[PDB]
Design a protein around this ligand. Structure first.
Ligand SMILES: *[C@@H]1O[C@H](CO)[C@@H](O)[C@H](O)[C@H]1NC(C)=O
Ligand SMILES: *[C@@H]1O[C@H](CO)[C@@H](O)[C@H](O)[C@H]1NC(C)=O
Ligand SMILES: *[C@@H]1O[C@H](CO)[C@@H](O)[C@H](O)[C@H]1NC(C)=O
Ligand SMILES: *[C@@H]1O[C@H](CO)[C@@H](O)[C@H](O)[C@H]1NC(C)=O
Ligand SMILES: *[C@@H]1O[C@H](CO)[C@@H](O)[C@H](O)[C@H]1NC(C)=O
Ligand SMILES: *[C@@H]1O[C@H](CO)[C@@H](O)[C@H](O)[C@H]1NC(C)=O
Ligand SMILES: *[C@@H]1O[C@H](CO)[C@@H](O)[C@H](O)[C@H]1NC(C)=O
Ligand SMILES: *[C@@H]1O[C@H](CO)[C@@H](O)[C@H](O)[C@H]1NC(C)=O
Ligand SMILES: *[C@@H]1O[C@H](CO)[C@@H](O)[C@H](O)[C@H]1NC(C)=O
Lengths: 380, 662
């Protein structure tokens, strides 16, 4: 059961992105950007030629970047101009799905940097160092589906989830998680000087009854006491989708200990995925290995629960820990027209119909649902 | 004539503005004084002290690209306010490493290192140029090289990672750590044409040009048109175009190798030495294989279309679109020649001077005319060993009357004008050599700096005045032209006057002047190696050699110099006739024979040859009885008429081929 109150726009404005910046909702739409907070929907127009606003990251001010008519360009929050004139790798050249995260002041994104569009995963210039980019064909043309930053004890690391499409005898999709060192310095050489030197990846695995799911929809890493737990949502070309959970501690341990797939010899002293003390640069042997064989000979198996299967075609999902109990969540996952909630404790799924073209669910303290009608806020 | 001999063949050479001449020979890189006398300093890149080439490099066919270990060597930032100049040197060793260093005492610490900057394949091409780019005008370095060569042995793996596999041009930054290349600061490649060989890189009108040509390092044959890739002079590669250069005029299959390049700066004219595949060393070496072609930089700048022919573009596929436009050289200037190896163009007194280096140790300069028409080249200097001139000539920066000719393993500093042979005005002024002018105070044809010691500038009469403007006697007699002093004394024989005054004599304070149909078949022609002094007797064998009155032989060596037209000496048997060839310059002239009337019958090539210098005598001593076949090793022995043994003379036989004979 769910009662949602609707703060709608004046018109049905095609949603293009939704972000949470310090419990303030930033809904990038065509034309303006909407700002939800305290049930207050402040719309701010920027331009309207094409200008699909897609990015609303926060570095120092929450700058907001869009694509004004095939030219990507940023702004300050209130339509003002960006001092640093950011905007190349911050917004796509055309309306697309993006993945752009911002740590302290360090923007990482998969957004296309040029017009042609070779897919790469980049960290842009800032406190971490100069720009970086993954070698080609590493990131699939579909893009990076999830990205989040997590401590590795002492060094920040960036994790990204994507779905590769291998094609040898038949096309097989494979879900991957990939780790990189947030403060990587680049490779050793001059050509490989702006390339990640700590990029590694493992296959995930979400099997239930011999049906293995392989297409990532969306991810979210909740931070708990002993470690953080990663919730992935897989879709399938069949009529099903499946939420799995993985223990980031198990993943980190696997990254640090497992062996590189296809590489049989002894791994060098600064082990490939390992972060390095500030200013250090990966040697050449380690880098040659880490670029040739960048996949561990392993497979991350999910936690025991909650694995569950919902409909096919879910688009978003967000978690909200129940205030009464603890480590028991309500996972609100959203389809084009129908809300669904799932309680990790009772393992029952509730549903609800809503006559709108939903786009996302965000959760700050109460699930707010971003649909083309406008925003809604939910109370059961 | 100061020479500096290295031990291994020169790999590169640059000349700093005020810090001497850097020469990268083997594993070691030396710096010398502009007089090429003392190695002021020296760096060892591979191993200390021992700077022998780690591996052996085969000096290949003169048309084929050479090989070395010092890919990049270029000074920059020199002549700054207080900042001492820098020298950027990139070697094959260490995966094609490149270090910035202070331009000066070589044994100082390299400021910034960097790996995979230059091609680490000793026979791979590399050409770089620094420039100003960025929001703060840093010094960037655009490097075009042959990074990936399909010759990797499992022992050592040069070829960079699979991401940087098809990289041709990269815009390194000389400030970032290890000379970092941006993501977009690199220009990819199309993998179909084999490899590319880049010859040069220069800036012109806000852009960088890379003259290259496709090439098969395995085969050894060009696989396409010599082209020029034009890139925007920025921080990220902005491919602005590519244009092929069509210098195959005067040769059947065309000239598809680019042997050397040079941008005539003040004229906005590129000048390139093209050649066709000359078999194996010299087997298809024709009278027209090499050709100096001049292109207007404006035409290349305008005709270069961004087509994905050799380089990947973001808007097409490899060779799935237009073909690059073929730019035509300045027609009135192309100089055909049997063996050309290097070019260097400059402008002095508003006249283009193109020094050229031939594959037989000649440095000969041409002076372009009014409509950039080439004159017949004067031979400036000749290397006694006929070693092929290294493909880069560097002008002395501190004395603009010298140039540093590199050849094999020897560098030397030679003047740019052999004006001591001119003894009069006209000889000094009709030759139209811009560097040379008449000098009254000395009364000699000399450079400017060698005779502007008298402050009255008109003492050193140059060519811009005109050849007629030297002093002469005019009839009521007077002096005409441009004299240095305004006071003289005339004396005729016997009226005398003084000064601008009035046998005839005009004496000055520093100098003086005084004055009182059937067929016609050609079997062959012999010999085919005539020495430079000509040959009195060249036998042409054929048929029906008596059914004709006026039979002529026309030799043409250089598409600019005139033709040697001669009549038959004494018409022998209707199968044989005999000619007499005069002196000429070392060349490989084409020989047509035109009978009483008609087209020329091209009998075949005929090469003048340098005089035979005598290297060594194998036994060097034999018993007074003699009879031991003394062996003499030398060069150009095949052209020897015969031998003399002077002590009384003794005629003795000879059994010889090109290089040696007993
Ligand atoms: C929304 O706009 C009103 C209009 O002035 C302003 O008073 C209010 O502070 C704004 N709230 C946010 C969260 O931007
Ligand atoms: C110099 O080093 C090369 C390395 O290949 C070696 O072959 C040569 O013998 C060395 N010469 C001396 C004098 O050390
Ligand atoms: C170069 O520096 C070294 C280092 O001390 C010194 O020994 C040498 O004399 C210097 N040579 C020149 C020409 O400056
Ligand atoms: C190569 O770079 C490293 C890093 O600074 C430096 O220690 C080393 O001296 C460099 N090598 C040369 C030959 O300059
Ligand atoms: C020409 O180049 C291609 C590609 O590099 C190579 O496969 C081929 O062998 C070369 N030609 C010869 C005669 O080897
Ligand atoms: C220099 O480049 C500009 C850029 O378009 C061009 O218009 C101009 O013609 C160039 N200069 C010459 C002399 O061609
Ligand atoms: C013609 O005479 C020359 C010598 O003058 C001789 O070598 C040649 O064999 C003769 N040929 C014929 C066909 O008689
Ligand atoms: C000594 O005799 C050998 C025998 O062939 C010869 O090659 C050499 O030139 C002679 N003279 C020397 C070694 O000075
Ligand atoms: C002397 O040697 C040369 C080649 O070395 C040979 O052609 C010649 O016939 C020899 N003479 C005698 C008399 O053996």
């Amino acid at each position: 059961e769910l009662e949602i109150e609707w703060h709608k726009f004046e018109t049905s404005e095609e949603i293009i992105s939704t972000y949470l910046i310090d419990d303030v909702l930033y809904t990038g739409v065509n034309g303006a950007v909407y700002t939800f907070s305290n049930n207050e929907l402040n719309k701010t127009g920027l331009t309207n030629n094409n200008n699909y606003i897609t990015t609303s990251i926060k570095v120092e001010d929450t700058l907001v970047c869009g694509t004004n008519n095939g030219n990507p360009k940023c702004w300050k929050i209130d339509g003002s101009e960006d001092p640093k004139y950011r905007g190349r790798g911050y917004a796509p050249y055309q309306n697309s799905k993006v993945t752009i995260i911002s740590h302290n002041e360090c923007v990482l994104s998969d957004i296309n940097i040029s017009k042609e569009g070779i897919k790469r995963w980049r960290r842009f210039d800032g406190p971490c160092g100069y720009d970086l980019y993954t070698a080609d064909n590493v990131i699939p043309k579909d893009g990076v589906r999830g990205a989040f930053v997590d401590k590795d004890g002492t060094y920040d690391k960036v994790y990204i989830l994507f779905t590769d499409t291998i094609d040898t005898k038949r096309i097989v999709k494979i879900p991957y998680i990939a780790q990189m060192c947030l403060n990587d310095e680049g490779g050793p050489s001059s050509l490989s000087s702006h390339r990640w030197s700590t990029f590694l990846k493992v296959e995930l695995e979400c099997d239930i009854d011999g049906r293995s799911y392989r297409q990532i929809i969306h991810s979210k890493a909740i931070k708990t006491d002993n470690d953080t737990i990663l919730y992935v949502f897989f879709d399938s070309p069949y009529s099903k989708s499946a939420l799995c959970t993985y223990s980031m501690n198990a993943i980190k341990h696997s990254f640090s200990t497992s062996k590189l797939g296809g590489y049989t010899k002894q791994l060098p002293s600064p082990a490939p995925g390992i972060c390095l003390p500030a200013g250090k640069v990966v040697p050449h042997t380690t880098f040659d290995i880490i670029e040739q064989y960048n996949e561990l000979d392993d497979i991350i198996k999910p936690l025991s629960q909650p694995i569950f299967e919902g409909p096919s075609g879910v688009k978003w999902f967000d978690i909200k820990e129940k205030e009464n109990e603890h480590r028991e969540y309500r996972i609100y996952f959203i389809k084009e027209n129908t809300i669904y909630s799932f309680d990790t404790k009772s393992k029952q799924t509730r549903s609800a119909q809503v006559d709108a073209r939903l786009f996302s669910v965000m959760v700050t303290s109460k699930p707010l649902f971003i649909a083309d009608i406008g925003i809604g806020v939910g109370i059961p | 004539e100061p020479v500096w001999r290295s031990e291994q063949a020169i790999g590169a050479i640059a000349a700093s503005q005020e810090d001497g001449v850097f020469v990268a020979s083997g594993s070691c890189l030396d710096q010398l004084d502009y007089s090429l006398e003392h190695s002021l300093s020296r760096l060892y890149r591979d191993q200390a002290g021992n700077c022998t080439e780690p591996v052996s490099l085969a000096p290949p066919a003169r048309p084929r690209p050479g090989s070395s270990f010092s890919k990049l060597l270029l000074p920059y930032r020199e002549g700054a306010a207080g900042l001492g100049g820098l020298l950027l040197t990139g070697w094959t060793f260490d995966r094609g490493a490149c270090e910035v260093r202070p331009l000066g005492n070589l044994s100082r610490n390299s400021l910034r290192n960097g790996t995979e900057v230059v091609s680490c394949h000793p026979q791979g091409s590399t050409a770089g140029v620094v420039y100003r780019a960025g929001r703060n005008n840093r010094w960037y370095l655009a490097v075009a090289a042959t990074y990936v060569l399909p010759e990797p042995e499992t022992a050592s793996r040069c070829n960079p990672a699979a991401s940087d596999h098809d990289t041709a041009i990269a815009l390194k930054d000389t400030e970032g750590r290890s000379l970092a290349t941006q993501e977009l600061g690199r220009l990819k490649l199309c993998e179909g044409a084999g490899s590319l060989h880049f010859v040069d890189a220069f800036l012109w009108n806000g852009s960088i040009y890379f003259p290259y040509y496709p090439y098969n390092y395995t085969s050894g044959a060009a696989t396409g048109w010599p082209s020029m890739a034009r890139i925007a002079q920025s921080t990220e590669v902005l491919f602005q175009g590519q244009a092929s250069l069509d210098c195959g005029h005067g040769h059947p299959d065309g000239r598809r190798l680019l042997l050397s390049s040079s941008l005539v700066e003040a004229l906005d004219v590129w000048a390139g030495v093209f050649s066709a595949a000359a078999g194996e060393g010299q087997e298809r070496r024709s009278p027209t294989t090499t050709a100096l072609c001049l292109f207007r930089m404006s035409e290349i700048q305008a005709r270069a279309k961004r087509v994905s022919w050799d380089f990947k573009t973001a808007e097409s596929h490899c060779k799935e679109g237009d073909q690059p436009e073929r730019v035509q050289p300045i027609a009135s200037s192309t100089l055909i020649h049997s063996d050309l190896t290097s070019v260097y163009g400059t402008v002095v007194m508003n006249r283009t001077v193109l020094f050229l280096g031939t594959g037989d140790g000649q440095l000969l300069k041409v002076i372009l005319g009014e409509n950039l028409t080439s004159n017949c080249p004067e031979v400036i200097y000749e290397i006694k060993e006929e070693t092929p001139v290294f493909y880069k000539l560097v002008p002395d920066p501190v004395k603009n009357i010298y140039i540093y000719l590199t050849a094999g393993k020897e560098v030397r500093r030679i003047r740019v004008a052999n004006c001591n042979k001119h003894k009069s005005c006209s000889e000094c002024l009709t030759a139209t050599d811009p560097h040379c002018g008449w000098c009254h105070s000395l009364q000699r044809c000399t450079f400017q700096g060698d005779c502007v010691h008298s402050e009255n500038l008109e003492n050193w009469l140059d060519i811009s005045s005109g050849a007629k403007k030297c002093p002469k006697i005019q009839i009521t007699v007077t002096m005409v032209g441009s004299f240095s002093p305004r006071h003289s004394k005339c004396m005729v024989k016997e009226l005398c006057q003084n000064k601008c005054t009035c046998n005839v004599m005009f004496s000055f304070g520093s100098w003086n002047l005084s004055d009182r149909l059937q067929v016609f078949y050609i079997k062959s022609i012999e010999p085919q190696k005539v020495s430079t002094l000509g040959k009195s007797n060249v036998i042409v064998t054929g048929a029906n050699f008596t059914r004709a009155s006026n039979i002529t032989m026309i030799l043409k060596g250089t598409s600019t110099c005139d033709k040697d037209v001669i009549q038959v000496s004494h018409v022998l048997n209707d199968t044989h006739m005999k000619f007499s060839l005069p002196s000429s310059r070392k060349e490989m002239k084409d020989v047509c024979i035109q009978f009483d009337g008609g087209n020329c019958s091209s009998v075949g090539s005929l090469s003048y040859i340098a005089l035979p210098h005598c290297s060594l005598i194998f036994p060097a001593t034999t018993w007074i009885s003699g009879g031991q076949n003394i062996t003499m090793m030398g060069r150009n022995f095949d052209v020897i008429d015969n031998l003399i043994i002077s002590h009384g003379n003794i005629n003795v036989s000879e059994y010889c081929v090109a290089t040696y004979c007993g």
